[PDB]
Amino acid sequence: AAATLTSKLYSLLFRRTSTFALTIIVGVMFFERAFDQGADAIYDHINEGKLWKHIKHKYENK
Amino acid sequence: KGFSYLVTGVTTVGVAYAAKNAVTQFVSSMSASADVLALAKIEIKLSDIPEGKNMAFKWRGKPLFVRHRTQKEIEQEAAVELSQLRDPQHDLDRVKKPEWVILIGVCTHLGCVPIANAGDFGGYYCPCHGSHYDASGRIRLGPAPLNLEVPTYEFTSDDMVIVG
Amino acid sequence: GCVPIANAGDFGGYYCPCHGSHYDASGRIRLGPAPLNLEVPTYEF
Amino acid sequence: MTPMRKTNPLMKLINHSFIDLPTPSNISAWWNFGSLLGACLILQITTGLFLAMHYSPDASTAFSSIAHITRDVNYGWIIRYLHANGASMFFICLFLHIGRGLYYGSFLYSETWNIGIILLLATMATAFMGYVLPWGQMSFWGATVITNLLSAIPYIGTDLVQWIWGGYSVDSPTLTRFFTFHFILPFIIAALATLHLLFLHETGSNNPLGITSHSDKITFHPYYTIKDALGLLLFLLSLMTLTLFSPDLLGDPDNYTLANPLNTPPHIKPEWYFLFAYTILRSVPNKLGGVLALLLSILILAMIPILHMSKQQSMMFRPLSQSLYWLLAADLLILTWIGGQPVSYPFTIIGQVASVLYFTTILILMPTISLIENKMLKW
Amino acid sequence: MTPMRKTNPLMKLINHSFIDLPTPSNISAWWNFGSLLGACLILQITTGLFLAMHYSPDASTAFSSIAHITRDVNYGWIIRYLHANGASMFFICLFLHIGRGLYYGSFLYSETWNIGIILLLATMATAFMGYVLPWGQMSFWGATVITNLLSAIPYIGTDLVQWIWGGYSVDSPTLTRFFTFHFILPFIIAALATLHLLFLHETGSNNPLGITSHSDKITFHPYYTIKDALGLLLFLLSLMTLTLFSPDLLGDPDNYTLANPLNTPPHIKPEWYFLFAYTILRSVPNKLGGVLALLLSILILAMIPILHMSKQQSMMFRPLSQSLYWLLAADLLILTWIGGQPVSYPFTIIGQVASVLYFTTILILMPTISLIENKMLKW
Amino acid sequence: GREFGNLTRMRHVISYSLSPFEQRAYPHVFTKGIPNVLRRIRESFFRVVPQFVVFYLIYTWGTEEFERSKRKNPAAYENDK
Amino acid sequence: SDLELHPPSYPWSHRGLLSSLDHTSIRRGFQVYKQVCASCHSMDFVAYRHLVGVCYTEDEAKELAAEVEVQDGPNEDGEMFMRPGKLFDYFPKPYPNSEAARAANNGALPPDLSYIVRARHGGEDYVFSLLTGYCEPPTGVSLREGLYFNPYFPGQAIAMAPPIYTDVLEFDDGTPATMSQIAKDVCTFLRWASEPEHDHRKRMGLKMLMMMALLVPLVYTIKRHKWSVLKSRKLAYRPPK
Amino acid sequence: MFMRPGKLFDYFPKPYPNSEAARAANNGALPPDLSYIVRARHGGEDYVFSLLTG
Numbered sequence A: 001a002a003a004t005l006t007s008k009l010y011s012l013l014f015r016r017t018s019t020f021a022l023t024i025i026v027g028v029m030f031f032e033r034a035f036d037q038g039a040d041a042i043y044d045h046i047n048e049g050k051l052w053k054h055i056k057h058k059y060e061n062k
Numbered sequence B: 001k002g003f004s005y006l007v008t009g010v011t012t013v014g015v016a017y018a019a020k021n022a023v024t025q026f027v028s029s030m031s032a033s034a035d036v037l038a039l040a041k042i043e044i045k046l047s048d049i050p051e052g053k054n055m056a057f058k059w060r061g062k063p064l065f066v067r068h069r070t071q072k073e074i075e076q077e078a079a080v081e082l083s084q085l086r087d088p089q090h091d092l093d094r095v096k097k098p099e100w101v102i103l104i105g106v107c108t109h110l111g112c113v114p115i116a117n118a119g120d121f122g123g124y125y126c127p128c129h130g131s132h133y134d135a136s137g138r139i140r141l142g143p144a145p146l147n148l149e150v151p152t153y154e155f156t157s158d159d160m161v162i163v164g
Numbered sequence C: 001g002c003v004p005i006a007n008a009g010d011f012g013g014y015y016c017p018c019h020g021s022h023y024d025a026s027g028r029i030r031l032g033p034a035p036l037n038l039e040v041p042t043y044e045f
Numbered sequence D, E: 001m002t003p004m005r006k007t008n009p010l011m012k013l014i015n016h017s018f019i020d021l022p023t024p025s026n027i028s029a030w031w032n033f034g035s036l037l038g039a040c041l042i043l044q045i046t047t048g049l050f051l052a053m054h055y056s057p058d059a060s061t062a063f064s065s066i067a068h069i070t071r072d073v074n075y076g077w078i079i080r081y082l083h084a085n086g087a088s089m090f091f092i093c094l095f096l097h098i099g100r101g102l103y104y105g106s107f108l109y110s111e112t113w114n115i116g117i118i119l120l121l122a123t124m125a126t127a128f129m130g131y132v133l134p135w136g137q138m139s140f141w142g143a144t145v146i147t148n149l150l151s152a153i154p155y156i157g158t159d160l161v162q163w164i165w166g167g168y169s170v171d172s173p174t175l176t177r178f179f180t181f182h183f184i185l186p187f188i189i190a191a192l193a194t195l196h197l198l199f200l201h202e203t204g205s206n207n208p209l210g211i212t213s214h215s216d217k218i219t220f221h222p223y224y225t226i227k228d229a230l231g232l233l234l235f236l237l238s239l240m241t242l243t244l245f246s247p248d249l250l251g252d253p254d255n256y257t258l259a260n261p262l263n264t265p266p267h268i269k270p271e272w273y274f275l276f277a278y279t280i281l282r283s284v285p286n287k288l289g290g291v292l293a294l295l296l297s298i299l300i301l302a303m304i305p306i307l308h309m310s311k312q313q314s315m316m317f318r319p320l321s322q323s324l325y326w327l328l329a330a331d332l333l334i335l336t337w338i339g340g341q342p343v344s345y346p347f348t349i350i351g352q353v354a355s356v357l358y359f360t361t362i363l364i365l366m367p368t369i370s371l372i373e374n375k376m377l378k379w
Numbered sequence F: 001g002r003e004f005g006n007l008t009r010m011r012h013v014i015s016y017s018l019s020p021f022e023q024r025a026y027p028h029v030f031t032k033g034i035p036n037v038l039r040r041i042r043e044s045f046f047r048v049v050p051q052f053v054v055f056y057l058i059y060t061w062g063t064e065e066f067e068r069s070k071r072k073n074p075a076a077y078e079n080d081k
Numbered sequence G: 001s002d003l004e005l006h007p008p009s010y011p012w013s014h015r016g017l018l019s020s021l022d023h024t025s026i027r028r029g030f031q032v033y034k035q036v037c038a039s040c041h042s043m044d045f046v047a048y049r050h051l052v053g054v055c056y057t058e059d060e061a062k063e064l065a066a067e068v069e070v071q072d073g074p075n076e077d078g079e080m081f082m083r084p085g086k087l088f089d090y091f092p093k094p095y096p097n098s099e100a101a102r103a104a105n106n107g108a109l110p111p112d113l114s115y116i117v118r119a120r121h122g123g124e125d126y127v128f129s130l131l132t133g134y135c136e137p138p139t140g141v142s143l144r145e146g147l148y149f150n151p152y153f154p155g156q157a158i159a160m161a162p163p164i165y166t167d168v169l170e171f172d173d174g175t176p177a178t179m180s181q182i183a184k185d186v187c188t189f190l191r192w193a194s195e196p197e198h199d200h201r202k203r204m205g206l207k208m209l210m211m212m213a214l215l216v217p218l219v220y221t222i223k224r225h226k227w228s229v230l231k232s233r234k235l236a237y238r239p240p241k
Numbered sequence H: 001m002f003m004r005p006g007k008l009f010d011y012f013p014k015p016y017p018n019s020e021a022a023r024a025a026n027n028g029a030l031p032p033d034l035s036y037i038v039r040a041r042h043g044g045e046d047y048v049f050s051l052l053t054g
């Protein structure tokens, strides 16, 4: 019987276009960090040992 | 309605993300090539320069003077007046270590190269008109509106000085 | 593009050190993998 | 109180062309490439402008300049690849933009159709002079061959070639003028494109059926904006996949070796989009014959409207014409494939057969079958 | 059959824009400098285009290429001087274009007047970047000074000056980057020039009297085509005299020396057409304040329509406003003269007085006198 | 003729439509969509495909004949002896 | 003469659509280049930088650059001298001019290796097969005394003597030196030298794929949403009778 | 690199290879190139003539 999640998201945010834009840009701010970090982790996990940042240990600090 | 507008709202997020990235690429291409950075700011220099000696270097196409100077030469700097300049500047406000002086190697009068360890002040001597300067290079005889340029340098290790 | 040798060739013409290809004085194909004869814009002497 | 987009002069033009443009509702994807072409142009322009800030149009430093762009300029490699790969996409859309008109009978719009022919020739010139800019082996020699093709003129000949070259051969002066011409023409194409759209608006777009669409016209802002915004997304998807996964697939090596006036590679084949005409040239032993063939090729497009004989626009309702169309397309594929292969017995004969088949189909078969179909319909 | 010029799409625009648009019969020669400007723009493109076929934008080969053009290239010297002197003629016509508007009240056409301001700013940018291309002693230092004057921006200045430089100095990357901008910008100006005419055409041209001339309009073609042709002939006369007899009077020597980074010339000065602004910034003691003055000035041109408070459009019947207008013209002459003189006590005070007099005239004196004149006539 | 106000003259026609928010964006995309696509493909299969098959056959044979030509000739060496 | 033997497709570690380049291989590949290759082949478009973030650290690169000697600009009131070399000098060329190189190599000119991989068909696959497979000529063919047979060369005759055999060098890593091993490392290093944006290019590709997967269905949904009103429209014709 | 006798297309020989050698032999002063000296200095040849005579 609880009001659907989308209905609440609409009345508070989507009804007013200015708030609709505000939530969009904040979502971009957050999604950018999340998407970037996730993609980078996947790429590194595909190529452990190949990437030089995983090789620094064998030779570092003289 | 909330469902449909959600789709649109999410779509814009994606369009925004790429948009920013794309622009940052094109703008970054204009900032500076890697070679520019490699050739510039790379001015590590040993501290082994004796007192009074002036080993010439190059920096941004400008000859650069780094001089260790004895205490009596610094006393001679005190003899010269920092209030007798068009742009007065207190001594320690110029040089972080009075025994060290880093300055440009071109005179501002006609682009001539001053002679190190010369002049009536014991500093620099321009043969083009016999202009005299001190170890700090304070404009004394010349049209230069202000003193000789004080290049930006930063001490990181006791033996190196970054200049960039 | 190898330069023919002066006063060379098995027939008094030119000799190519790159592959041993021989060319006559007139540059005609006589030996060697060269597809066409030596290209000179004008046979003016 | 009334809308402000119906008073301001700058908004009247945008309203006419973009927002309240009456457009048929049943137009398929084939009608999207038009927009994409302009979009691709807008991309090329910007991409090239950024490459111009670091390119030295000199025969002794052009090749080194590109090497410096891809190794020292921030994101220079991607910009260069986007420009190169975006040119191939231009032609792909352009060939599909011309095929639609051939199939659906859009050539009946004389004015618009003729403007397109000019646009095609202008774009072809732009791509040829751009490809010589890198100053690779293929670039140097490709220009030489194509430029020596004007010597076939009866009495002038050499004069034009030496005039274009600015000398007795291809060297720095040729490179510099080509750089300037490469820079300028795209902006001229933009003006031609506006004339293209100008003459189009007087009549409107042609629906796939070929019947008058005045009963089912809809506005352009809400429907075809999103439909053409989805097409552009797909266009970018294809372009980015090509650039980011196969940067050198539609190109050719030997462009990464410095141009040598003395050495010459064996195959020396031109770019893929300039291959069908290349085979047509080689099919005719005579030089004058070949150049006339190349020109006669493009001219056919201008003559196609005159060769139309059927009483219908679209070939959707004429299956025999459809089969001929697809055979003609396959012939073009054969021409392209032959252009990519060395000169040998089987390829040479196949090229000659393809060339004659090409011309005969357009000039003879299509009008004849059109009349035949008119007979079976008791017109 | 009716004339084709009223039915063909391309001919409708030409007929409206040139052949048949009504124009006032009494417009004087002042109304002839608008057409000349475009002609000069056309002249500036073609000449520059040919120069681009031989110029090499590099720190080392730029000066050499100019010498090569002047001596070895056929008729290179005349082309270069037409380009150089055409620039000065362009600004002379441009100032006269602006002056006419201020005197006869043309600024009342807000939409058209505002677009004009953009054209002026773009023109100045094109001219400033072009002056760097020769890469002489004056070009190097002129760019250095006029660029280092963005370090005064509150917090981003230093970041936005190195970015423009492409480095920590002014070197070849700046030269190539300016070259591309120099090429592209004029074509944008051409497009904007079509918006200028477009917004003008929806209202019609003004006349010296300031009264509407609907009663006595005339077709543009016969009368004004020949009149503008006469103006073009006179404009060519002036240009050819400058180039063919005394090409270098209006230039500044010492630009014929190779740019020496470690040699500051004793007397750095901008070009004659930019001097008026130089003195307005050199006078203000604060570096940032001087930039704010050079900008607030140019923009008072945008504020002129607001400050207008007279009940008559044309200053022809306003004798006191005429005296102020000529006084302001004299002030601009003084500013120009001071710009070319070294820093010293007499010139500095004269420049300071001229700057304040310039501003106060535009702001206070002109509105107040217009109000008094209105009071005199008993409106 | 170029303005929606006056394009054609129609009469005795009615139309019915629903709002975008009152209907599904993918209605019968499992039971009625796929079969329609299959109809489209089948209805134009023989008009296009077979010609491009001929192209493939011409392409394969060609390559085969080209390579077949470079093979050495045993009939040019039997007598060479 | 005869159609050149096409090299086979080898299983490189970066053949995959999303794979990268093993950076330890590049390190050993460069080590090979430092002496065995640089005798007459040259890399005109590489500097001692470009390696700081790839294989070697800052300090090790600087120390390595100190081992070379370049010629510096004219001394003021003097002439040219010799400078140690810093991290902005490109790799030393072996000969002042092409003609001198030809003289020392029986007229053959060793091409620059900066773009060799992208220059030749087959890429590194071609180079690997080329470095190996130095067999003797079959029965019925003769060669100039200063040429060597190689079935992968388009003419089968090449002036390159076999450059790599076993135990020519000694890796500091401890990896045994084997003709196959050295060839693999140098081929990887060359593939990098012709494409140092390899890893970055593929990372951006990965992000592009995921972004398209999210976007394409979304944009299509919006298109269907707006167009639904037209796709469901129903029409009727009711003349006066 | 060998030395030719010289041809028409050749330019006038350089007195010195580099500016450093020129100044070293001219007591620090660098003699400017004369190809554009007339149009570079103020006063034209009037300056040059009076310069040599005075």
Ligand SMILES: COC1=C(OC)C(=O)C(C/C=C(/C)CC/C=C(\C)CC/C=C(\C)CC/C=C(\C)CC/C=C(/C)CC/C=C(\C)CC/C=C(\C)CC/C=C(/C)CC/C=C(\C)CCC=C(C)C)=C(C)C1=O
Pocket (backbone or CB within 6 Å): E110, E111, E114, E115, E118, E121, E122, E124, E125, E126, E128, E129, E146, E185, E188, E192, E270, E271, E274, E275, E277, E278, E279, E281, E294, E299, E302, E303, E306
């Ligand atoms: C002494 O050394 C110096 C010199 O010498 C050496 C100099 O030379 C200079 C001069 C500087 C010179 C080069 C450098 C300065 C360069 C610049 C400011 C500009 C920077 C930009 C350039 C290269 C790029 C130029 C930009 C271009 C092409 C972009 C524009 C593109 C377009 C199509 C134009 C489109 C515009 C469109 C649609 C808008 C349409 C409408 C309008 C005009 C209408 C007006 C609208 C309005 C609100 C205004 C109306 C207002 C009203 C009523 C209110 C009144 C206003 C008030 C203000 C009161 C300096 C400073 C100097 O130090």
Ligand SMILES: COC1=C(OC)C(=O)C(C/C=C(\C)CC/C=C(/C)CC/C=C(\C)CC/C=C(\C)CC/C=C(/C)CC/C=C(\C)CC/C=C(/C)CC/C=C(\C)CC/C=C(\C)CCC=C(C)C)=C(C)C1=O
Pocket (backbone or CB within 6 Å): D125, D128, D146, D147, D149, D150, D181, D188, E017, E018, E021, E031, E032, E034, E035, E037, E038, E039, E041, E042, E043, E045, E046, E190, E191, E193, E194, E197, E220, E224, E228
């Ligand atoms: C007072 O009342 C008035 C008004 O108010 C009622 C008005 O309103 C107006 C109208 C206002 C005005 C003019 C003012 C300005 C306003 C305007 C609208 C116009 C704006 C201007 C413009 C866009 C600029 C227009 C153009 C200019 C300079 C020209 C630049 C562009 C070009 C095409 C020009 C041509 C350059 C050419 C040909 C190059 C020269 C070289 C040629 C021979 C050699 C060329 C060779 C080649 C391309 C070779 C190619 C070879 C190839 C591919 C090789 C092929 C090889 C094979 C083998 C096939 C007026 C006048 C008026 O008075």
Ligand SMILES: COC1=C(OC)C(=O)C(C/C=C(\C)CC/C=C(/C)CC/C=C(\C)CC/C=C(\C)CC/C=C(\C)CC/C=C(\C)CC/C=C(\C)CC/C=C(\C)CC/C=C(\C)CCC=C(C)C)=C(C)C1=O
Pocket (backbone or CB within 6 Å): B026, D017, D023, D031, D032, D034, D035, D036, D037, D038, D039, D041, D042, D045, D046, D049, D190, D191, D193, D194, D197, D205, D224, D228, E125, E128, E129, E146, E147, E149, E150, E164, E181, E184
């Ligand atoms: C299918 O149905 C459809 C139809 O049919 C029914 C249709 O009909 C249409 C109709 C529409 C079309 C097809 C659309 C396309 C239509 C066309 C004709 C195509 C037209 C294309 C174009 C004009 C090309 C557009 C792009 C162009 C020219 C390039 C754009 C970019 C630029 C000039 C550069 C912009 C700036 C950039 C990158 C920023 C970098 C630079 C800088 C900051 C500048 C640096 C500084 C300087 C210059 C310095 C200036 C200041 C200086 C010196 C000093 C200042 C002062 C100081 C004091 C320092 C559609 C869509 C459709 O779908």
Ligand code: HEC
Pocket (backbone or CB within 6 Å): G036, G037, G039, G040, G041, G105, G108, G109, G110, G111, G113, G116, G120, G127, G130, G158, G159, G160, G161, G163, G164, G186
């Ligand atoms: C050390 C491993 C090594 C690699 C990898 C290498 N070189 Fe070469 N290389 C040449 C010469 C000369 C050519 C041109 C023709 C030839 O191969 O003989 C050439 C050609 C090549 C080619 C192919 C040329 C073409 O046109 O396809 C490659 C690839 C190459 N070198 C890379 C002298 C050398 C020398 C000097 C003794 C050495 C050492 C040498 N080469 C060692 C190496």
Ligand code: HEM
Pocket (backbone or CB within 6 Å): D030, D031, D032, D033, D034, D035, D037, D038, D094, D097, D098, D101, D106, D107, D109, D112, D113, D114, D115, D116, D117, D119, D120, D123, D193, D196, D200, D204, D205, D206, D207
């Ligand atoms: C080269 C750049 C070109 C651009 C930017 C361009 C632009 C456009 C655009 C945006 C459309 C509208 C698309 C539509 O409504 O279907 C269009 C239509 C058209 N184009 Fe082009 N075009 C170009 C080249 C060509 C060429 C080479 C031809 C060759 C004949 C051509 C012929 C046509 C025709 C006939 C139409 C009308 C189609 C119809 O009415 O259905 N165009 N063009």
Ligand code: HEM
Pocket (backbone or CB within 6 Å): D041, D044, D045, D046, D048, D049, D050, D051, D052, D055, D066, D080, D083, D084, D087, D090, D123, D126, D127, D130, D131, D132, D133, D134, D182, D183, D186, D187
């Ligand atoms: C329809 C418009 C255009 C087309 C079809 C086109 C096509 C091309 C092509 C195919 C190349 C060679 C790509 C390669 O060798 O990999 C090229 C090169 C180039 N083009 Fe254009 N171009 C266009 C517009 C422009 C514009 C407006 C500019 C403005 C500066 C420009 C500047 C350049 C430059 C600088 C290069 C050098 C490429 C390089 O250095 O790698 N192009 N162009």
Ligand code: HEM
Pocket (backbone or CB within 6 Å): E030, E031, E032, E033, E034, E035, E037, E038, E094, E097, E098, E101, E106, E107, E109, E112, E113, E115, E116, E117, E119, E120, E123, E193, E196, E200, E204, E205, E206, E207
């Ligand atoms: C820079 C290139 C420019 C071109 C090619 C151009 C062109 C023209 C032309 C052809 C006319 C009509 C004929 C004439 O007045 O002589 C005109 C009128 C006008 N121009 Fe410009 N113009 C330019 C710049 C400017 C600028 C910088 C302004 C600054 C105020 C301006 C303001 C005006 C005004 C207010 C009119 C209306 C004249 C009237 O109503 O009588 N224009 N322009």
Ligand code: HEM
Pocket (backbone or CB within 6 Å): E041, E044, E045, E046, E047, E048, E049, E051, E052, E055, E066, E080, E083, E084, E087, E090, E126, E127, E130, E131, E132, E133, E134, E182, E183, E186
């Ligand atoms: C209104 C348009 C233009 C103006 C006001 C303008 C102005 C100038 C100016 C003042 C110079 C300095 C020349 C000197 O001091 O000797 C110059 C140089 C140059 N401009 Fe233009 N220009 C315009 C259009 C163009 C165009 C369209 C091009 C090329 C397409 C071009 C190419 C050049 C070149 C190559 C130079 C170097 C000439 C030299 O160094 O003497 N310009 N321009």
Ligand code: FES
Pocket (backbone or CB within 6 Å): B107, B109, B110, B112, B126, B128, B129, B130, B131, B141, B142, B143
């Ligand atoms: S050179 Fe310094 S005062 Fe003359």
Ligand code: FES
Pocket (backbone or CB within 6 Å): C001, C002, C016, C018, C019, C021, C032, C033, C034
């Ligand atoms: S080099 Fe001439 S035949 Fe090989």
